[PDB]
Amino acid sequence: VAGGGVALIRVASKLADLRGQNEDQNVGIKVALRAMEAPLRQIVLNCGEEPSVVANTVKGGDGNYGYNAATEEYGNMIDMGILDPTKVTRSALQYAASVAGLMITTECMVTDLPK
Amino acid sequence: AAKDVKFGNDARVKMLRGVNVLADAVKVTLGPKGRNVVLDKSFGAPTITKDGVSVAREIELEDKFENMGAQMVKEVASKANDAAGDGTTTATVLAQAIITEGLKAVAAGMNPMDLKRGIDKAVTAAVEELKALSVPCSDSKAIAQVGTISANSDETVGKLIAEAMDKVGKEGVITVEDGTGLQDELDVVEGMQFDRGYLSPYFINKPETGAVELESPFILLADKKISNIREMLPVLEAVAKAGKPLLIIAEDVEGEALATLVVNTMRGIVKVAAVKAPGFGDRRKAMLQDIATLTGGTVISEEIGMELEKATLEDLGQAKRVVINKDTTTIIDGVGEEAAIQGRVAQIRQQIEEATSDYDREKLQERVAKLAGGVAVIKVGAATEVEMKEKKARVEDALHATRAAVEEGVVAGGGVALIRVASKLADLRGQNEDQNVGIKVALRAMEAPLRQIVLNCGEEPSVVANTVKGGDGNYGYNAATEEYGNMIDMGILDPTKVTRSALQYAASVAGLMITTECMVTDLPK
Amino acid sequence: AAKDVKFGNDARVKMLRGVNVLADAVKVTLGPKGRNVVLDKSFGAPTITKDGVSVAREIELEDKFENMGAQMVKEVASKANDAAGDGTTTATVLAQAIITEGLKAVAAGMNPMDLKRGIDKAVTAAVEELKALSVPCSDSKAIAQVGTISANSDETVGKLIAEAMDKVGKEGVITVEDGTGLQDELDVVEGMQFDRGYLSPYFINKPETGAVELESPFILLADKKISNIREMLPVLEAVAKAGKPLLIIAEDVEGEALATLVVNTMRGIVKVAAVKAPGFGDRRKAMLQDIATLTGGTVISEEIGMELEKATLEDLGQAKRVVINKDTTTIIDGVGEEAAIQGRVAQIRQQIEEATSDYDREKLQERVAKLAGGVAVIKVGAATEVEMKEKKARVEDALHATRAAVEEGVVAGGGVALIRVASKLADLRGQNEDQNVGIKVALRAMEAPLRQIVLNCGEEPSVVANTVKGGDGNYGYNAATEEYGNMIDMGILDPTKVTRSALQYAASVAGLMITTECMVTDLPK
Amino acid sequence: AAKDVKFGNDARVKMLRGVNVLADAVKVTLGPKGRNVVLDKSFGAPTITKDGVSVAREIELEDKFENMGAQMVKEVASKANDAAGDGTTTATVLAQAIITEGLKAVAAGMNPMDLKRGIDKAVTAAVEELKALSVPCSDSKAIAQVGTISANSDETVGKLIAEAMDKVGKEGVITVEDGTGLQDELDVVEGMQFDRGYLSPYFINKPETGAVELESPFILLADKKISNIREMLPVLEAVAKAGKPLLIIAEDVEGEALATLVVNTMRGIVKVAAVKAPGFGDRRKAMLQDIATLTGGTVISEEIGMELEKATLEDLGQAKRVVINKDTTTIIDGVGEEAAIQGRVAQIRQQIEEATSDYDREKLQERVAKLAGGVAVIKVGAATEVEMKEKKARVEDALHATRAAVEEGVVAGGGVALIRVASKLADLRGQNEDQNVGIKVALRAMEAPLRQIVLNCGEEPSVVANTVKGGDGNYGYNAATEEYGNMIDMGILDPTKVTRSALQYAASVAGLMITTECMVTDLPK
Numbered sequence A: 001v002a003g004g005g006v007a008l009i010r011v012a013s014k015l016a017d018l019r020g021q022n023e024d025q026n027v028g029i030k031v032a033l034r035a036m037e038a039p040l041r042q043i044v045l046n047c048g049e050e051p052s053v054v055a056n057t058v059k060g061g062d063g064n065y066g067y068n069a070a071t072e073e074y075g076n077m078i079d080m081g082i083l084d085p086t087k088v089t090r091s092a093l094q095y096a097a098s099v100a101g102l103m104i105t106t107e108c109m110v111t112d113l114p115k
Numbered sequence B, C, D: 001a002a003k004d005v006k007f008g009n010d011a012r013v014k015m016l017r018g019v020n021v022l023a024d025a026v027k028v029t030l031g032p033k034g035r036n037v038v039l040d041k042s043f044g045a046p047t048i049t050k051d052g053v054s055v056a057r058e059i060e061l062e063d064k065f066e067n068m069g070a071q072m073v074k075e076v077a078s079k080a081n082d083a084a085g086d087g088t089t090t091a092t093v094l095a096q097a098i099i100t101e102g103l104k105a106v107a108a109g110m111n112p113m114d115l116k117r118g119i120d121k122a123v124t125a126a127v128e129e130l131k132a133l134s135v136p137c138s139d140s141k142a143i144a145q146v147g148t149i150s151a152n153s154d155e156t157v158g159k160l161i162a163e164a165m166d167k168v169g170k171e172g173v174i175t176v177e178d179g180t181g182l183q184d185e186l187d188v189v190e191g192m193q194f195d196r197g198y199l200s201p202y203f204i205n206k207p208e209t210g211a212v213e214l215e216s217p218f219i220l221l222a223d224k225k226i227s228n229i230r231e232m233l234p235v236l237e238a239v240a241k242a243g244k245p246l247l248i249i250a251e252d253v254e255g256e257a258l259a260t261l262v263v264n265t266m267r268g269i270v271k272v273a274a275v276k277a278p279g280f281g282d283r284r285k286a287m288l289q290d291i292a293t294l295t296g297g298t299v300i301s302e303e304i305g306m307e308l309e310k311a312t313l314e315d316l317g318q319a320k321r322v323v324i325n326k327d328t329t330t331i332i333d334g335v336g337e338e339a340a341i342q343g344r345v346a347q348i349r350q351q352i353e354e355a356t357s358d359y360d361r362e363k364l365q366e367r368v369a370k371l372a373g374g375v376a377v378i379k380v381g382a383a384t385e386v387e388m389k390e391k392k393a394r395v396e397d398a399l400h401a402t403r404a405a406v407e408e409g410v411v412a413g414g415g416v417a418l419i420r421v422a423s424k425l426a427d428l429r430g431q432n433e434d435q436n437v438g439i440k441v442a443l444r445a446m447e448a449p450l451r452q453i454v455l456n457c458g459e460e461p462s463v464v465a466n467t468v469k470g471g472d473g474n475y476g477y478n479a480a481t482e483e484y485g486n487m488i489d490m491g492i493l494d495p496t497k498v499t500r501s502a503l504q505y506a507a508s509v510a511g512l513m514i515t516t517e518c519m520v521t522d523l524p525k
């Protein structure tokens, strides 16, 4: 899939209509939606440009359109070769969501005594 | 006593800390979605406001240098206020953005004088581009529109301002009063307006308004300095026998005549409000004669021979009402005969005809204008005294915005004025790298008010800034509805004068503010 | 002097700490099982109270920001008090619940503007649904019932309120006095009622009541501003010769006339209570003429010609008694002739007949209503002066609750009003997610008073809340018996106006209080 | 254990503090008026030096992050040292100036990646302009001149380097030895040079030089990994019976074979120095056969069949002397027959003739070059063993400067090389404002070495910098005489390679240095 974070951006743009069984699961869905947009924003922030402007520009475009970071210009990833395996992005998102679901529901944190 | 100085980058960072504190304190309130700011009152509830005047005036910081920076930015905000009447949050946001980017550039070793010159050239270009972009509000319909929009989208207030504007003309005098009936009472009566303020803030009966409103006062006209209060002693005795408010118009009031009048107003057995003599020299004497004609009074001069001690109740002028603003005084329904006022108008008209000096001719022309046009009075009409005072405040700031728009023009409000000015000036260069950087400082800082309005609305400032910059004309982002569109369609408008003055004073204090190194102060004790 | 600002989440958490402190302090007393809160008196025993007015008014916190939170919530509780007279614990509980859930939502990054708008729409829907659910109390039996229930389940007090309510009609004036005999005395005397308060709190003879009660006072009628006290000097000399209480009715009282009258009341050789002029303009002058007809007095005006110096003992009006509340003043048994009052009634009735303007027509209609109906007086009767004063206080707050019920309606008390309103409004959505969340804030927060009543009873708040929500109608949980049932059957009732005002002002301060970022304060010193 | 991170501007100021500390510490020594820096030896007197290698190598800071910055700049100075041999003070001055201007620009909010790209393009332009400005030193007279100037203005050392340069040709092998007689002994013996260093620093007999000099050592040739020391056990027994130094050439030496050899050298009964196998694959095997021909040895390989255990004293090669530098090893006067070496030269010459791959042909050509040219030995001649060792060190660094000049070229020393490069590149722009600022950072930072030389002389750096910039060509400011003039006339010269490498690694570490945000570190304990 087209690399540069636009994979997760397009996935989020394809899933804004998904609801949950109540308000809290719906909020968790929205948490995931505003959080898979993070890698593109962080790439842009490393480039120094405005993360929100570029995120909205990529979301406005449809398909594989995104923002090249090396040239710092917009365009199609497939034309300029910026690509990522589906497996690595899927596994990264799966493991991030798994550790987050385990991690959110953590209350007691027992530790060796500070000595 | 002894003092500590601070010079270098520590001085600028102390100052920047202070200006950031004050500017955030007031910029929380910017825009129609501006958040409320709470302020201490010593007794009772803490006041809460979306007005940056009240927030800024309240600020003073504990550290003397942060205090110093705060006092500078507050004073320039108050200067932009007194120039226009509104937009102090806009002026402070612009001043903060310019000074933060400027001091950050100076910490990069760029020349402070060159950076200030760059901001100076960029703001001169911004002023002239705003004049080119300024849309006139000479038509009565846009006058009614800006009067509506200024006063909480109330069409009645802007309407009344429109008819009063028609009555007294393009530069005429409009004043608000409280009307008994639920209908608004619009009238025109021959009166006076001149640009002279009070001698002391203790003469103001209403600190919430800032003006001295006197009903049926006796007016004294003097062309001499008030050296001693013995000259005012028979007048004070006469006005204490009369038991009515007293207005004094004199050439100079000395510090101890003022001190005795302040002590007397603290005693308050007499109601004394004093103003300086308007005009200069022979012009001042002539228009003081005009005021004496208007009120039936007499001008007292040392050179002619009469003294302030030799004053009777008949010699003093009188009127139905007077108002003494911060820097202005108007007189409503003077007792003096309209036939004598007409004769004075005629006399100054042949003075116009025989006038050869252009400036003197303009002085005589504005004399006949103020002497013939008179004053329109809009008396607020509704059911409750509460809505009397709130609708009166709405009429006040609405007419302030209206006259500010009439003087210069109107441009689409909501920050898109400065955004469009910046989009029209990205190609302006400087005489070297540092002046060019200062130009870019001004360019990235005039975009600050729109970003701050959006940030108060909660939306993304950069996205909306680029959305407005992409569009051309008066297209922008309405903040009340939180939707894009044309400001002129939805009526969001700002006077060209208030925005121009806000940017001008922000850039002026920023040029004086970047180039500050030594900061002497009272010792922290 | 210098000041400290606090903006961000630390500002809101300081405010939240303060409002939590005050709201718990007063909400311990909520409900009939409300626990005692003990407050320090400087001398003697500390007072003990179940009334949230006394607890809230006493509160001020050591930290200036927590002090600010406390002062905000206390002031809105006092505002809802002056609107209604009771239910300040309910207003503070509602304000606390709304502000806690709202600030918790804001800390989750939701838009404070949108959240406040959601609370605003939800509370407007709650107000209209409460109006729909409001049961009128126009019948005399329910008037007697609410008068009984308000005054510690005393049927005699509510009964007397019911007959007085019949005598002066649906919007008439009822005033409590102390009667000599053990039997309750109940009379109608033609008098005056108008909504004008005192000029200073130092004019109140009884701070425990809050009103100025004067027996056989001389009343002065004025239509002018009291600029100087020399105008009041012959009146003060005459009333010092008379040695009786003095009432002043004037257009304006200046700050120094007020200061001299405060100094005189501290001297206390004269008994002076001053009020503003009721009404506005020609209406004010006409009804002042009506008051002069009622008391045999004369109105003094600058325009007509007479002065306050030219005042005799005959010119001043007189009456058997006057009462000057916080914002209210009534006059009982004026000396002026009933035939002259009837002639004035006829004159203003013909003014009604010739009236074409609407607002003037209901002004003249309420003028003839207050001039013809008079005032009912309930003189309390019992054996001991102690039970005289406690039954007098019971009559006071019972008639306050009665008039509040009569104005708007009555709904089943005990918190089930807001519970039913919430159960009727769970389907209301907002324009986005954040306004919807604010609606849910209001929904989960109007259930707070019932939960707090139950928690004061010691039972489980959630169980009882769900039990009341399961039932439909007026079913709820009686707290005195700690048993379920119908509030109307056990008579537990609350006026619609007090609950509506409590929720309205709680939501108003919560909208103004969620959206507070900059918190500027006097420096901690 | 656990760690502290520091990211943001605090990281960059910690790093900048560290690099400023180290760079000032070394730049006090820059230039011929370079001041003495005194460094502690744990025993006896503290050493004193004008050489930045010794100062920089000593520095490590107490704060962990300043230590990080110092270690980075020291490592890049050492990298530029190992590339060239001199100019570490110049490299550190350039790195400090670039990083100070760059981090100051980043503190102005410019893009660190864009700024690094600007420095990258500016330094690429500087490299190509320095190549264009480079004057070749192919002539023997300038070789003698640079050899004189490098070795403390000693014409004899530069002379001897010039003849040796003639004997072994333009790219031949020259090595310094100690000669007994006062006359210098300049000879040619057929030998070996290859670019392979030692396995461990503990193999160096002379830490003050950095090389392993062995007189009459036995050389073992191996093409296999030394997995275990049992393979080296019979060789160690044989060389212990012989009692002579031992050289090992093997494919790989494992960490434990190296550990056992380090333990043996600490035991020191055997004198073992090991190097990696030079070359790769078939080329490595062929040139190892060449080395075995040179020394009379035999190459041991796992694939052919013989083992390192099956080694006799005849099978190992021998030579009169070997030197094992940091990354280089040369062999002087191998025992192997010159006729066999000539036959091997012929065989690799027909290998050249049948070669079709260009790279393989170049490998065979450099093989025949090193196998036929041999090694020139300059045996230093003087009277005292002291002046033997300092004149030996002078020959060492003089021939290092000579080979550096011969490889690339020579440009007028004294900082005027970078000054002229900067004056040739002031018109180079970038792709935006930030890359342009990075270009300007490089431009105002290549002028730093001349300014630092002048500042060490005590004169005004800015005046001399502008004086040199005004002149064109090779005009500059002599520091030894403190007079202006042409460097080439007065002989102050620097190799193009050392200055180019100093600027290259300075710009490389500065690009890697600017874009540093997060610094993990060992916790301060």
Ligand SMILES: Nc1ncnc2c1ncn2[C@@H]1O[C@H](COP(=O)(O)OP(=O)(O)OP(=O)(O)O)[C@@H](O)[C@H]1O
Pocket (backbone or CB within 6 Å): A003, A004, A005, A039, A043, A067, A068, A069, A070, A071, A082, A083, A084
């Ligand atoms: N030219 C480019 N334009 C935009 N995005 C790019 C470009 N090249 C790579 N990326 C994106 O940047 C990321 C690659 O970052 P990087 O190579 O530093 O590490 P990584 O692959 O995310 O992780 P790691 O190396 O830590 O396992 C990917 O999300 C890739 O899609």
Ligand SMILES: Nc1ncnc2c1ncn2[C@@H]1O[C@H](COP(=O)(O)OP(=O)(O)OP(=O)(O)O)[C@@H](O)[C@H]1O
Pocket (backbone or CB within 6 Å): B029, B030, B031, B032, B034, B050, B051, B052, B053, B085, B086, B087, B088, B089, B090, B413, B414, B415, B449, B453, B477, B478, B479, B480, B481, B492, B493, B494
């Ligand atoms: N509906 C709107 N949409 C967008 N911008 C608006 C809207 N209404 C007002 N504005 C802008 O918001 C600002 C008005 O802010 P506000 O009323 O708080 O005070 P001000 O005029 O900026 O200054 P101050 O009252 O401190 O002197 C102006 O810049 C105005 O153009």
Ligand SMILES: Nc1ncnc2c1ncn2[C@@H]1O[C@H](COP(=O)(O)OP(=O)(O)OP(=O)(O)O)[C@@H](O)[C@H]1O
Pocket (backbone or CB within 6 Å): C029, C030, C031, C032, C034, C050, C051, C052, C053, C085, C086, C087, C088, C089, C090, C413, C414, C415, C449, C453, C477, C478, C479, C480, C481, C492, C493, C494
């Ligand atoms: N028997 C009862 N059962 C249930 N709820 C009751 C009962 N009696 C009163 N209440 C409720 O308790 C509250 C009365 O509390 P309380 O008399 O302490 O003060 P308040 O009217 O809330 O306010 P204030 O602070 O102004 O006195 C009202 O909400 C009322 O509906």
Ligand SMILES: Nc1ncnc2c1ncn2[C@@H]1O[C@H](COP(=O)(O)OP(=O)(O)OP(=O)(O)O)[C@@H](O)[C@H]1O
Pocket (backbone or CB within 6 Å): D029, D030, D031, D032, D034, D050, D051, D052, D053, D085, D086, D087, D088, D089, D090, D413, D414, D415, D449, D453, D477, D478, D479, D480, D481, D492, D493, D494
């Ligand atoms: N007489 C001179 N006049 C001007 N510059 C000179 C003179 N002699 C040497 N230089 C310059 O001074 C520097 C030599 O200083 P120094 O020998 O202390 O250190 P280095 O060669 O830069 O490096 P290292 O620290 O590795 O010894 C070079 O830049 C050289 O061009």
